[PDB]
């Protein structure tokens, strides 16, 4: 549901092929919260339940509201803590393949994180969807260091924060149909390229 450790649980002896890591939006609950779930679903579906671990960004990060507004959109300390679990996944399963994502904050998180990224792990990651990216006018619609064939923004018109402001308006609350096809068929396509099938 809410709440996904399967890198933090996972046994090394036995790598998933497949390690998503997500970061939620602001105030949401367990370390998946509105639209992790639905994108880990389908994931599972397409990779099997063995074969993907989902682990969602929880310890320091806290998805505090006030943080959209430091420098990178989120916290030092949330930063440190995505890039630890990125960090961890590299150390447990060096030939898993990586993918992520993050919505609203989250999105920030993921592309402070994969900015700051040691490059032999960040690339590793085959594919990353951003929603509600607040950093999205700024960045223009890329994270730095990263490439944009394996970048996917969702962006709706009329979300304040892809725009440049931190206004959340109604369409920033309006991604779950993102999360439950494009999102996942995205990142499903992106592993495939990589690994065949």
Known sequence: ??????????????????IFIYARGSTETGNLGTLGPSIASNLESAFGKDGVWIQGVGGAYRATL????????TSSAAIREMLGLFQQANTKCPDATL???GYSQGA?????????????????IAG????????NLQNLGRIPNYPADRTKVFCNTGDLVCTGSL?????????????????????IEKVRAVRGS
């Open 99 to 101: 993918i992520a994502g």
């Open 128 to 135: 990353t969807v951003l929603f509600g990216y607040t950093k």
């Open 1 to 18: 549901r809410t709440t996904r450790d399967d890198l933090i649980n996972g046994n090394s002896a036995s790598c998933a092929d497949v």
């Open 108 to 124: 920030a998180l993921a592309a402070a994180s994969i900015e700051d990224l040691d490059s032999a792990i960040r690339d590793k």
């Open 167 to 187: 206004i959340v308006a109604a369409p920033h609350l309006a991604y779950g149909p993102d999360a439950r096809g494009p999102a996942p068929e995205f990142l």
């Open 66 to 73: 006030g943080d959209n507004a430091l420098p990178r959109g």
